[PDB]
């Protein structure tokens, strides 16, 4: 069951009570992923999923507390009894140990066999409802798995890792790219296995190694530069997986505070160190309700970016989109365009393919909708500035440069006539005066001995560096140049 050192922290009657359980558990050698998820799923349940308080359950109670700001009010918190949580912990533990016989598998000196890993995978896989939409909120925790039998894509891989911990396996860890999750194991942890589906269509890639996706240079596996989690990072994941969202437009104030505090907790113990996405997540949270005494969002986005550069060969994309998004919100045109340019710079070394849909859509919305709506806006301030800055126009070409370089060597075409119309319209938003102060040099002298400058890496963009910097924009020719 639960060790007595865990039990004494119960019951939790507030957010602060929960943070304590998390600090306590993070100081152990083997943080209890199962215990922690169950608490998170339990508290998310009554704060996001069923905010209506039950009236005929003598077991479940709620804790009254002083309202946050002027509005209201008494905020009620779902008190997590020990008996409730212990029963859930117990049922999960039973399920697994029941279904698998560690006798049929000899652990070779702290080494879990691959047949063992597939087995634990199946146990989870075969345990989940056939009947549900996998694309909704509040089905990430083990609370969800044990209660309703529903788990979203990434949640399955977390479930498989928590289940291995329940069996005392300690070499099976969570592998984590930016839009997919799987498992790493073996001695020194260079064995991998798919354990969940990905995307809209459920193509089960499970049982397979990951080598194929690393090889195809797809953004899903990050050229082999994905995160290999330790127990402490798996706790950070959980905290990120917290979903404060009640409605499409409404969010739970306590679930936001909880995720915020838990992220700070992690930050301080140096656990966000290697987790760019957690850093940006935390940054976004700070922008909404800054806690006094702490660093700026902008600081944090850069830590995230720093982390990506140090630990993952600057091969990640979200840390920039986090930043870009920030500026795009505070209407900082130049910093937006720069950060988007940096994003494309990272993507240029990838190939595009079917399963990279999540990121394709992001470049598409940025290129076709978010940049145009943002230029058009500034087209109206100087009419009563950035539309008069060659750095921004250069930031923009660097953007379409990275995207053209993406398309290169890729199975499916990235560009089509739909991208062209808005490239044409975005350029046109700049004065010939301005477009011309930018010089597209090839590189004068390679190496070193003892307006602004821009150099293209893609054939398309350099093939037409003349039409871009012209005075009439040849709409028709620029369009023919983006296809091949």
């Amino acid at each position: 069951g639960l060790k007595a050192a865990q039990k004494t922290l119960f019951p939790l009657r507030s957010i602060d009570d929960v943070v304590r359980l998390f600090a306590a558990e993070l100081g152990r050698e083997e943080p209890d992923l199962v215990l922690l998820s169950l608490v998170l799923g339990f508290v998310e349940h009554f704060l996001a999923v069923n905010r209506v308080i039950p009236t005929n359950v003598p077991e479940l109670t709620f804790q009254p507390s002083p309202a946050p700001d002027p509005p209201g009010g008494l905020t009620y918190f779902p008190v997590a009894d020990l008996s409730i949580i212990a029963a859930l912990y117990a049922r999960f533990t039973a399920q697994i140990r029941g279904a698998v016989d560690l006798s049929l598998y000899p652990r070779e000196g702290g080494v879990s066999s691959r047949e063992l890993v597939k087995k634990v995978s199946d146990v989870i896989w075969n345990s989940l409802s056939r009947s549900y939409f996998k694309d909704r909120a509040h089905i990430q925790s083990l609370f969800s798995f044990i209660t309703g039998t529903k788990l979203d894509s990434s949640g399955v891989a977390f479930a498989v890792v928590g289940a291995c911990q329940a069996l005392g396996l300690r070499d099976v860890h969570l592998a984590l790219s930016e839009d997919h999750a799987w498992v790493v194991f073996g001695p020194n942890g260079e064995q991998t296995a798919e354990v969940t589906w990905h995307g809209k269509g459920n193509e089960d890639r499970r049982g397979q190694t990951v080598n194929a996706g690393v090889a195809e240079r797809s953004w899903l596996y990050l050229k082999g530069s994905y995160m290999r989690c330790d127990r402490k990072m798996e706790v950070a994941f959980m905290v990120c997986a917290i979903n404060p969202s009640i409605d499409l437009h409404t969010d739970s104030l306590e679930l936001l505070q909880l995720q915020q505090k838990l992220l700070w907790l992690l930050y301080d113990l140096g656990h966000l160190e290697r987790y760019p996405m957690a850093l940006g997540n935390l940054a976004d949270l700070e922008e909404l309700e800054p806690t006094p005494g702490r660093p700026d969002p902008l600081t944090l986005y850069h830590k995230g970016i720093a982390s990506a550069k140090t630990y993952y060969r600057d091969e990640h994309i979200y840390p920039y989109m986090y930043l870009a998004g920030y500026h795009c919100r505070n209407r900082n045109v130049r910093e937006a365009l720069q950060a988007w340019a940096d994003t494309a710079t990272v993507i240029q070394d990838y190939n595009y393919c079917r399963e990279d849909e999540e990121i394709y859509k992001e470049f598409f919305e940025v290129a076709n909708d978010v940049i145009p709506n943002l230029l058009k806006e500034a087209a109206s301030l100087l009419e009563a500035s950035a539309l008069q800055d060659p750095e921004c126009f250069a930031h923009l070409l660097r953007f379409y440069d990275g995207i053209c370089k993406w398309e290169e060597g890729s199975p499916t075409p990235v560009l089509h006539v739909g991208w062209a119309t808005f490239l044409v319209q975005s350029l046109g938003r700049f004065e010939g005066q301005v477009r011309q102060k930018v010089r597209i040099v090839s590189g004068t002298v390679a190496g070193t001995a003892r307006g602004p400058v821009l150099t293209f890496q893609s054939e398309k963009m350099k093939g037409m560096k003349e039409l871009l910097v012209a005075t009439k924009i040849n709409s028709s020719a620029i369009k023919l140049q983006l296809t091949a």
């Binding site: 694309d135 909704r136 990434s154 839009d179 917290i242 987790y275 940006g280 999540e358 919305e365």
Partner: peptide, 12 residues
Amino acid sequence: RLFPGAPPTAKK
């Protein structure tokens, strides 16, 4: 966007 820690879509 459901992947934990993923950033908000830049659009609307």
